[PDB]
Amino acid sequence: AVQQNKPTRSKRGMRRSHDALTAVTSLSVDKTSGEKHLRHHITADGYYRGRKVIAK
Amino acid sequence: MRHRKSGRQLNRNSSHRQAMFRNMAGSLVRHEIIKTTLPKAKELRRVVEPLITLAKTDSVANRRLAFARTRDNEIVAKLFNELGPRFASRAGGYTRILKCGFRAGDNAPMAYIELVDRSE
Amino acid sequence: SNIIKQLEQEQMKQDVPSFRPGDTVEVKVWVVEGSKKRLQAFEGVVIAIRNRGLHSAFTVRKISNGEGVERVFQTHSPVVDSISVKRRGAVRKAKLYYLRERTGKAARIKERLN
Amino acid sequence: IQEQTMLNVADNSGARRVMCIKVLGGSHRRYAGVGDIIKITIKEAIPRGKVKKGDVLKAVVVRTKKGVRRPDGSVIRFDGNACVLLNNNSEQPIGTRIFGPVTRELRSEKFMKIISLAPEV
Amino acid sequence: MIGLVGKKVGMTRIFTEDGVSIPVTVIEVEANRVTQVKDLANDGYRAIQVTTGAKKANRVTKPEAGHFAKAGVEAGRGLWEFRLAEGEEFTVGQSISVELFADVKKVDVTGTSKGKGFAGTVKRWNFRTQDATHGNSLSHRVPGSIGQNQTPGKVFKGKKMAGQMGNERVTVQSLDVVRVDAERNLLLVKGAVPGATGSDLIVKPAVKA
RNA sequence: GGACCGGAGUGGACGCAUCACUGGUGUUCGGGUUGUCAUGCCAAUGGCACUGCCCGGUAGCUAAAUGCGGAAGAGAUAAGUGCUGAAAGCAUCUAAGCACGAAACUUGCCCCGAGAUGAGUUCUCCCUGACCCUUUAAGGGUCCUGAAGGAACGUUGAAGACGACGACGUUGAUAGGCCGGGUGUGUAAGCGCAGCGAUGCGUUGAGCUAACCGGUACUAAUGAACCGUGAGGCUUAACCU
RNA sequence: CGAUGUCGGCUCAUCACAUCCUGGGGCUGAAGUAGGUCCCAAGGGUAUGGCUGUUCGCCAUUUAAAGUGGUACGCGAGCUG
């Protein structure tokens, strides 16, 4: 349940080949207010697609 | 494995799930708007809108059934007085899930769940 | 689209009578001993399920000489032809699986309104 | 039925309780409970019976709580397990009269005598 | 009289529900046609492939749409290729031939499997569980020994341990007699229609298996 | 007493699949009940007491349930039995030739399988615009166009640890909801009648009822946008150069 | 000897064939059923219990059969004591 040799910096950084953060790579621009949001999310000012869905 | 199975146990027991859902249905019927997590919102509508379609027929038996659920007479009074006839013409879909940003304390997919009301 | 649930209805038996659990029913069953084909009578309290299509059956308990025999008959099988409701019984539960265990006891009779 | 199964007896000569010591036929055959032959001992006997306590001989299972399935899907379940005592070598019933119901699958080879002596088939 | 099978099994198969399928002709009028005819130029073998069902003609990809577009654009959902007999011409005979005596003998079956997830070593192969109470520190359903100490020094390749079961193919044969009908004199074809849709086609000579 | 050879059925153990049946489980369906608290109280319900204890039980999963299977064949054979036959004018299964011969071998049956770097084949679809420096099949940068398709994202699945793999994305039944049914529990509440009362009877097979079945845009599945290009090297061989 | 945990059982096995059964032959004091021995063959299969910790061993009963060995007298970073 323990190692017998120290794994290298090559193997240590090579296990971290798949541990990289993937981006959103695209946002969506709301037609009413030109700010950008996530796909299928509120535009952080209270707008979905075409109505101000949040009064606050 | 699970096949053809419904209901998300929400990392909590059956009694707590029922109590959460009674409290959440009362909060939705009271305030017309709830910010909660996405699976909580989906199961919330799956247990709220049965009450609204129970509430179209105003009878003492249906008040007692709608009081066996959610356990609040203000909620049954609202659900049979103002809701009910406001949603009489609709056939399902008394709720709308709008997703918002993730929670600050934990990465939770949060969602505004609300009815199909108007402001005035 | 609007197709399914009729292949099981092609081979129903629409001459079946309606019975509640608790009645003592008589089931005539075809049996084959050779070239001839005769009938068998089975009496006893029925512990039924309602009509799950062709896949519906009812459980009948009889005591011959001290111990009970339970026979479940498929309702729409060709070997079961005739059911007679006979004496009609009054019980509360849909399944009499525990009231069938006791000995010397018979359910109460109710004939007016089912 | 299985090994270490206490069984009642239908025939008169077989006396009260018998217990299955081996499930005959097959290598690791575990459960044989319909018309199969089982080796029994006699665990408790009345003196009126011809057999006595501690005697090993064969049997055939006649009634079972598991119940036999008919071809149409019907299940005939008997309350309490029963057997009819047989000789070890000749495999014929010692008992002159058979008590209780029997099933129509007990018709093959030496069991026509059992269903002939039995009241209800 | 002489006449036998060719490039023909059937045209119609209905969605699976139970898997026994005692046959009865239902009255509903739809139209089905062979659409797929391959090209002639660039191949040294002349092969033909079949399809079933219907697609929306919106999620069909343009390569697949062009595949189906040779002789009439009606798409399906799947494709399966097979060998060469001779080619493709019209071999239709006269009206009524095969009504006399030689109807059917048996049929065959074909299937697929269901996904049971990352199944265990008791679910997957029928392992025996160790005794749960006489001691048994954390070893009730675990795999036991997987090898033989030092001289192998490794675990063998065909070893039964815990993994995913399901999502595979199965195949079976040889269904039997269930019931007969004689008095009303109806034309009958017999057999349980084979398995789930996703079968590989039965292209066979005379009855070997 | 008692046959190999050749057929017919029916079992034991094993393995695969399935949920139609028989069942089990079903803490999310219904009902009976004990103790107690609350909803102002009667009534009716809810909360705790392992799901309070039980009684049944839908879907799903499942075996103890059901369906199937390990073959028949073909080639080359080991042991052995042989034909023809000299060496060795007779003989001899072998040295030249030839014919049989088993659950072993190779195929036959079922799965993975072109990372088979020996990277294969077939069908279809899509792209046929310019300018500079050129340390030259040269090769790099700028503007435009960025297809077929994929990915992302939502609804999700009888697929699944995460990925992945299926179905759907408003010219939409993909998931919830709603409507009608089916199943399961077993005559709900309210009212009336009888009874001192518990309780009984009628309304009433009533009321609830899931994951199931058929239908329906009521709610969420937005239109962008992202990646992927712009005809694809050099020799050699067939129609004009 | 600056530590290679000791039997048996359970779970899981794999290999050799000096073959228990099934398969093909020879010989036999092989009339047939049934046997004995020898050759080829490792594809598959190759018990449940009472006794005491047992490997063994006795016995009841079964099966076509309950094989002999190797694998740290297989298997304790898998379990038991």
mmCIF file of N, CA and C in Angstrom, chain B residues 19-93:
data_model
loop_
_atom_site.group_PDB
_atom_site.id
_atom_site.type_symbol
_atom_site.label_atom_id
_atom_site.label_comp_id
_atom_site.label_asym_id
_atom_site.label_seq_id
_atom_site.Cartn_x
_atom_site.Cartn_y
_atom_site.Cartn_z
ATOM 1 N N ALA B 19 -40.491 16.291 4.430
ATOM 2 C CA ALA B 19 -40.582 17.528 5.199
ATOM 3 C C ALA B 19 -40.025 18.718 4.422
ATOM 4 N N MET B 20 -38.867 18.532 3.779
ATOM 5 C CA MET B 20 -38.316 19.490 2.823
ATOM 6 C C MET B 20 -39.312 19.876 1.757
ATOM 7 N N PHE B 21 -40.047 18.897 1.265
ATOM 8 C CA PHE B 21 -40.931 19.151 0.148
ATOM 9 C C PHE B 21 -42.190 19.884 0.593
ATOM 10 N N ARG B 22 -42.712 19.565 1.783
ATOM 11 C CA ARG B 22 -43.820 20.331 2.351
ATOM 12 C C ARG B 22 -43.431 21.781 2.592
ATOM 13 N N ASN B 23 -42.251 21.999 3.173
ATOM 14 C CA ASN B 23 -41.774 23.351 3.436
ATOM 15 C C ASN B 23 -41.511 24.121 2.146
ATOM 16 N N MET B 24 -40.948 23.452 1.144
ATOM 17 C CA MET B 24 -40.653 24.086 -0.131
ATOM 18 C C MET B 24 -41.923 24.435 -0.895
ATOM 19 N N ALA B 25 -42.918 23.541 -0.875
ATOM 20 C CA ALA B 25 -44.195 23.821 -1.517
ATOM 21 C C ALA B 25 -44.907 24.979 -0.842
ATOM 22 N N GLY B 26 -44.843 25.035 0.487
ATOM 23 C CA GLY B 26 -45.378 26.184 1.194
ATOM 24 C C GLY B 26 -44.661 27.479 0.859
ATOM 25 N N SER B 27 -43.333 27.425 0.727
ATOM 26 C CA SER B 27 -42.568 28.625 0.398
ATOM 27 C C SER B 27 -42.850 29.100 -1.024
ATOM 28 N N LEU B 28 -43.000 28.163 -1.966
ATOM 29 C CA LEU B 28 -43.331 28.518 -3.345
ATOM 30 C C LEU B 28 -44.719 29.126 -3.446
ATOM 31 N N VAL B 29 -45.703 28.509 -2.785
ATOM 32 C CA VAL B 29 -47.076 29.001 -2.825
ATOM 33 C C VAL B 29 -47.186 30.348 -2.120
ATOM 34 N N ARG B 30 -46.399 30.561 -1.065
ATOM 35 C CA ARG B 30 -46.395 31.849 -0.384
ATOM 36 C C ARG B 30 -45.751 32.933 -1.237
ATOM 37 N N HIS B 31 -44.482 32.758 -1.598
ATOM 38 C CA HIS B 31 -43.702 33.872 -2.116
ATOM 39 C C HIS B 31 -43.730 34.008 -3.630
ATOM 40 N N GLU B 32 -44.290 33.031 -4.360
ATOM 41 C CA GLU B 32 -44.400 32.932 -5.823
ATOM 42 C C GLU B 32 -43.057 32.738 -6.531
ATOM 43 N N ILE B 33 -41.949 32.643 -5.803
ATOM 44 C CA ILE B 33 -40.598 32.612 -6.355
ATOM 45 C C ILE B 33 -39.694 31.938 -5.331
ATOM 46 N N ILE B 34 -38.817 31.059 -5.804
ATOM 47 C CA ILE B 34 -37.847 30.386 -4.951
ATOM 48 C C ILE B 34 -36.540 30.274 -5.721
ATOM 49 N N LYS B 35 -35.440 30.703 -5.099
ATOM 50 C CA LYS B 35 -34.108 30.345 -5.557
ATOM 51 C C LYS B 35 -33.663 29.111 -4.781
ATOM 52 N N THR B 36 -33.464 28.010 -5.494
ATOM 53 C CA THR B 36 -33.018 26.747 -4.925
ATOM 54 C C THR B 36 -32.169 26.030 -5.964
ATOM 55 N N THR B 37 -31.651 24.863 -5.596
ATOM 56 C CA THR B 37 -30.825 24.107 -6.520
ATOM 57 C C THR B 37 -31.678 23.453 -7.603
ATOM 58 N N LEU B 38 -31.014 23.069 -8.695
ATOM 59 C CA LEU B 38 -31.702 22.498 -9.856
ATOM 60 C C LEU B 38 -32.425 21.170 -9.603
ATOM 61 N N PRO B 39 -31.835 20.137 -8.968
ATOM 62 C CA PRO B 39 -32.645 18.935 -8.694
ATOM 63 C C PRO B 39 -33.746 19.168 -7.679
ATOM 64 N N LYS B 40 -33.505 20.050 -6.704
ATOM 65 C CA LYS B 40 -34.545 20.435 -5.763
ATOM 66 C C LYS B 40 -35.683 21.149 -6.470
ATOM 67 N N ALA B 41 -35.362 21.956 -7.482
ATOM 68 C CA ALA B 41 -36.391 22.633 -8.261
ATOM 69 C C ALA B 41 -37.212 21.656 -9.097
ATOM 70 N N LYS B 42 -36.559 20.667 -9.714
ATOM 71 C CA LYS B 42 -37.280 19.697 -10.540
ATOM 72 C C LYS B 42 -38.222 18.829 -9.705
ATOM 73 N N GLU B 43 -37.725 18.291 -8.593
ATOM 74 C CA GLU B 43 -38.601 17.532 -7.710
ATOM 75 C C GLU B 43 -39.638 18.422 -7.025
ATOM 76 N N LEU B 44 -39.316 19.704 -6.836
ATOM 77 C CA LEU B 44 -40.250 20.648 -6.244
ATOM 78 C C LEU B 44 -41.451 20.871 -7.142
ATOM 79 N N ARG B 45 -41.221 21.052 -8.443
ATOM 80 C CA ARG B 45 -42.374 21.217 -9.323
ATOM 81 C C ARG B 45 -43.140 19.910 -9.449
ATOM 82 N N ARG B 46 -42.416 18.783 -9.430
ATOM 83 C CA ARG B 46 -43.043 17.463 -9.497
ATOM 84 C C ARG B 46 -43.923 17.169 -8.278
ATOM 85 N N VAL B 47 -43.713 17.862 -7.157
ATOM 86 C CA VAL B 47 -44.630 17.741 -6.021
ATOM 87 C C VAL B 47 -45.502 18.974 -5.765
ATOM 88 N N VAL B 48 -45.269 20.105 -6.433
ATOM 89 C CA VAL B 48 -46.122 21.274 -6.214
ATOM 90 C C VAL B 48 -47.322 21.240 -7.138
ATOM 91 N N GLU B 49 -47.097 21.036 -8.432
ATOM 92 C CA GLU B 49 -48.234 21.184 -9.339
ATOM 93 C C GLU B 49 -49.345 20.120 -9.270
ATOM 94 N N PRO B 50 -49.109 18.903 -8.738
ATOM 95 C CA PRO B 50 -50.248 18.116 -8.228
ATOM 96 C C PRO B 50 -51.154 18.834 -7.239
ATOM 97 N N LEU B 51 -50.618 19.697 -6.377
ATOM 98 C CA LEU B 51 -51.476 20.418 -5.443
ATOM 99 C C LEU B 51 -52.345 21.442 -6.161
ATOM 100 N N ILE B 52 -51.783 22.125 -7.156
ATOM 101 C CA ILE B 52 -52.541 23.128 -7.892
ATOM 102 C C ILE B 52 -53.619 22.466 -8.745
ATOM 103 N N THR B 53 -53.343 21.284 -9.308
ATOM 104 C CA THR B 53 -54.436 20.626 -10.018
ATOM 105 C C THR B 53 -55.406 19.918 -9.081
ATOM 106 N N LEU B 54 -55.032 19.687 -7.822
ATOM 107 C CA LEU B 54 -56.030 19.304 -6.829
ATOM 108 C C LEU B 54 -56.912 20.480 -6.445
ATOM 109 N N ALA B 55 -56.367 21.686 -6.521
ATOM 110 C CA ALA B 55 -56.990 22.881 -5.982
ATOM 111 C C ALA B 55 -58.000 23.535 -6.911
ATOM 112 N N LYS B 56 -58.224 22.990 -8.103
ATOM 113 C CA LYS B 56 -59.210 23.574 -9.004
ATOM 114 C C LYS B 56 -60.632 23.293 -8.532
ATOM 115 N N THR B 57 -60.868 22.113 -7.967
ATOM 116 C CA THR B 57 -62.179 21.745 -7.448
ATOM 117 C C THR B 57 -62.247 22.066 -5.960
ATOM 118 N N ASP B 58 -63.023 23.085 -5.609
ATOM 119 C CA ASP B 58 -63.098 23.584 -4.238
ATOM 120 C C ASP B 58 -64.081 22.724 -3.461
ATOM 121 N N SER B 59 -63.551 21.807 -2.661
ATOM 122 C CA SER B 59 -64.359 20.947 -1.816
ATOM 123 C C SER B 59 -63.642 20.767 -0.493
ATOM 124 N N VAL B 60 -64.413 20.441 0.548
ATOM 125 C CA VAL B 60 -63.861 20.254 1.888
ATOM 126 C C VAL B 60 -62.919 19.058 1.909
ATOM 127 N N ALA B 61 -63.263 18.008 1.160
ATOM 128 C CA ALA B 61 -62.400 16.838 1.052
ATOM 129 C C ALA B 61 -61.079 17.181 0.385
ATOM 130 N N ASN B 62 -61.117 18.046 -0.627
ATOM 131 C CA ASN B 62 -59.884 18.438 -1.293
ATOM 132 C C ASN B 62 -59.074 19.418 -0.456
ATOM 133 N N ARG B 63 -59.729 20.232 0.377
ATOM 134 C CA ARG B 63 -58.993 21.031 1.356
ATOM 135 C C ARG B 63 -58.303 20.137 2.378
ATOM 136 N N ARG B 64 -58.965 19.053 2.794
ATOM 137 C CA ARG B 64 -58.348 18.150 3.762
ATOM 138 C C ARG B 64 -57.214 17.349 3.146
ATOM 139 N N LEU B 65 -57.324 16.991 1.869
ATOM 140 C CA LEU B 65 -56.198 16.348 1.200
ATOM 141 C C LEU B 65 -55.051 17.328 0.987
ATOM 142 N N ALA B 66 -55.351 18.573 0.614
ATOM 143 C CA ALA B 66 -54.332 19.602 0.452
ATOM 144 C C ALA B 66 -53.826 20.145 1.775
ATOM 145 N N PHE B 67 -54.422 19.737 2.890
ATOM 146 C CA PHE B 67 -53.894 19.982 4.221
ATOM 147 C C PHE B 67 -53.126 18.795 4.779
ATOM 148 N N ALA B 68 -53.426 17.580 4.314
ATOM 149 C CA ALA B 68 -52.581 16.430 4.615
ATOM 150 C C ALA B 68 -51.210 16.573 3.975
ATOM 151 N N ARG B 69 -51.132 17.296 2.868
ATOM 152 C CA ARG B 69 -49.881 17.738 2.282
ATOM 153 C C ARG B 69 -49.649 19.179 2.725
ATOM 154 N N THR B 70 -48.386 19.540 2.950
ATOM 155 C CA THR B 70 -47.855 20.895 3.183
ATOM 156 C C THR B 70 -48.277 21.568 4.487
ATOM 157 N N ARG B 71 -49.331 21.058 5.137
ATOM 158 C CA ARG B 71 -49.640 21.265 6.556
ATOM 159 C C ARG B 71 -49.717 22.731 6.978
ATOM 160 N N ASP B 72 -50.211 23.588 6.090
ATOM 161 C CA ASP B 72 -50.313 25.003 6.427
ATOM 162 C C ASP B 72 -51.621 25.548 5.873
ATOM 163 N N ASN B 73 -52.460 26.073 6.763
ATOM 164 C CA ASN B 73 -53.782 26.516 6.346
ATOM 165 C C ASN B 73 -53.741 27.807 5.553
ATOM 166 N N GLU B 74 -52.705 28.629 5.739
ATOM 167 C CA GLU B 74 -52.496 29.765 4.847
ATOM 168 C C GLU B 74 -52.189 29.293 3.436
ATOM 169 N N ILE B 75 -51.445 28.191 3.313
ATOM 170 C CA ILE B 75 -51.108 27.645 2.004
ATOM 171 C C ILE B 75 -52.342 27.048 1.339
ATOM 172 N N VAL B 76 -53.167 26.314 2.097
ATOM 173 C CA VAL B 76 -54.397 25.756 1.520
ATOM 174 C C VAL B 76 -55.386 26.861 1.159
ATOM 175 N N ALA B 77 -55.454 27.917 1.976
ATOM 176 C CA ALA B 77 -56.319 29.055 1.685
ATOM 177 C C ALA B 77 -55.885 29.798 0.429
ATOM 178 N N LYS B 78 -54.586 30.074 0.282
ATOM 179 C CA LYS B 78 -54.083 30.684 -0.946
ATOM 180 C C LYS B 78 -54.286 29.773 -2.145
ATOM 181 N N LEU B 79 -53.960 28.492 -1.990
ATOM 182 C CA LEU B 79 -54.015 27.522 -3.071
ATOM 183 C C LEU B 79 -55.433 27.272 -3.547
ATOM 184 N N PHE B 80 -56.442 27.478 -2.698
ATOM 185 C CA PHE B 80 -57.807 27.294 -3.173
ATOM 186 C C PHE B 80 -58.517 28.608 -3.466
ATOM 187 N N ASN B 81 -58.016 29.738 -2.962
ATOM 188 C CA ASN B 81 -58.645 31.027 -3.210
ATOM 189 C C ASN B 81 -58.034 31.745 -4.412
ATOM 190 N N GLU B 82 -56.742 32.077 -4.348
ATOM 191 C CA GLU B 82 -56.170 32.890 -5.415
ATOM 192 C C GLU B 82 -55.532 32.030 -6.497
ATOM 193 N N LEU B 83 -54.619 31.143 -6.126
ATOM 194 C CA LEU B 83 -54.284 30.037 -7.002
ATOM 195 C C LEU B 83 -55.468 29.081 -7.055
ATOM 196 N N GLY B 84 -55.474 28.203 -8.051
ATOM 197 C CA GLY B 84 -56.693 27.513 -8.379
ATOM 198 C C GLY B 84 -57.361 28.156 -9.572
ATOM 199 N N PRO B 85 -58.303 29.071 -9.322
ATOM 200 C CA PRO B 85 -58.951 29.797 -10.427
ATOM 201 C C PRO B 85 -58.019 30.647 -11.263
ATOM 202 N N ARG B 86 -56.862 31.053 -10.739
ATOM 203 C CA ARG B 86 -55.882 31.725 -11.584
ATOM 204 C C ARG B 86 -55.261 30.744 -12.566
ATOM 205 N N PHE B 87 -55.183 29.473 -12.181
ATOM 206 C CA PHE B 87 -54.617 28.439 -13.029
ATOM 207 C C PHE B 87 -55.670 27.459 -13.516
ATOM 208 N N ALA B 88 -56.928 27.890 -13.582
ATOM 209 C CA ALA B 88 -58.019 27.007 -13.979
ATOM 210 C C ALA B 88 -57.970 26.659 -15.461
ATOM 211 N N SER B 89 -57.574 27.611 -16.302
ATOM 212 C CA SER B 89 -57.525 27.389 -17.740
ATOM 213 C C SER B 89 -56.306 26.593 -18.179
ATOM 214 N N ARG B 90 -55.290 26.478 -17.335
ATOM 215 C CA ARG B 90 -54.067 25.794 -17.722
ATOM 216 C C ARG B 90 -54.185 24.292 -17.501
ATOM 217 N N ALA B 91 -53.519 23.535 -18.365
ATOM 218 C CA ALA B 91 -53.485 22.078 -18.292
ATOM 219 C C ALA B 91 -52.035 21.689 -18.050
ATOM 220 N N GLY B 92 -51.638 21.689 -16.787
ATOM 221 C CA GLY B 92 -50.268 21.408 -16.428
ATOM 222 C C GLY B 92 -49.377 22.618 -16.580
ATOM 223 N N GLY B 93 -48.128 22.442 -16.167
ATOM 224 C CA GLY B 93 -47.113 23.459 -16.357
ATOM 225 C C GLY B 93 -47.330 24.730 -15.578
#
